[PDB]
């Protein structure tokens with residue numbers, strides 16, 4: 072598919088058995104998902120953005136479906152206003168920027 | 171060009187006649203550049219992201235060259251950690267996401 076940038080590039084994702092809306096984000100190194108009760112072991116992490124840092128939980132080898140395309144990798148969970156799909160997962164679904 | 175996402179999508183820009191490095195960022199609504207002297211009129215504004223809100227100078231109708239392509243639009247100047255090119259200027263140069 073091709074997505075224009077007139078509006079935020081939001082798509083449907085599936086994670087932990089739940090459907091959510093998330094932003095395809097070429098400026099994010101990491102994938103950050105809103106607070107949810109994911110099972111299993113995690114490691115403490117701090118991540119930065121414009122504004123400063125927030126505390127998150129790092130989960131490894133998490134399955135996520137992005138606009139119908141399957142991926143598996145690291146997902147950070149904590150208090151974000153928007154679910155963001157970063158480059159660690161955009162590469163797995165074959166995404167590029169074109170102009 | 172077609173840009174893949176295994177590395178950060180960094181390009182050269184020209185702004186106020188000066189060369190800088192900046193990130194092509196589909197997750198950003200706006201364009202935010204590090205503190206600099208810039209010819210043009212400005213007004214105070216506040217913007218947010220992952221760790222909270224910061225104070226910036228808003229400059230309208232600024233000429234900027236992005237990887238060899240011309241844009242003329244709004245640039246925010248302030249204590250951002252990384253120079254970011256957001257959707258207000260990505261749309262001007264014809265950029266799309268593809269997968």
Ligand SMILES: CC(C)(C)NC(=O)[C@@H]1C[C@@H]2CCCC[C@@H]2CN1C[C@@H](O)[C@H](Cc1ccccc1)NC(=O)[C@H](CC(N)=O)NC(=O)c1ccc2ccccc2n1
Pocket residue numbers: 096097098099100101102118119120121151152153155157195196197198199200201202217218219220251252254256
């Ligand atoms: C630029 C502005 C217009 C303020 N927009 C945004 O900030 C929106 C805000 C939205 C709501 C809050 C949740 C984030 C989304 C997406 N972001 C865009 C989004 O693309 C944003 C832009 C950015 C990049 C680099 C440095 C600063 C800011 N990325 C991020 O916040 C990601 C988060 C992450 N850890 O993956 N940061 C980075 O990937 C990153 C990279 C280098 C750094 C160097 C020093 C300090 C911090 C650094 N952070």
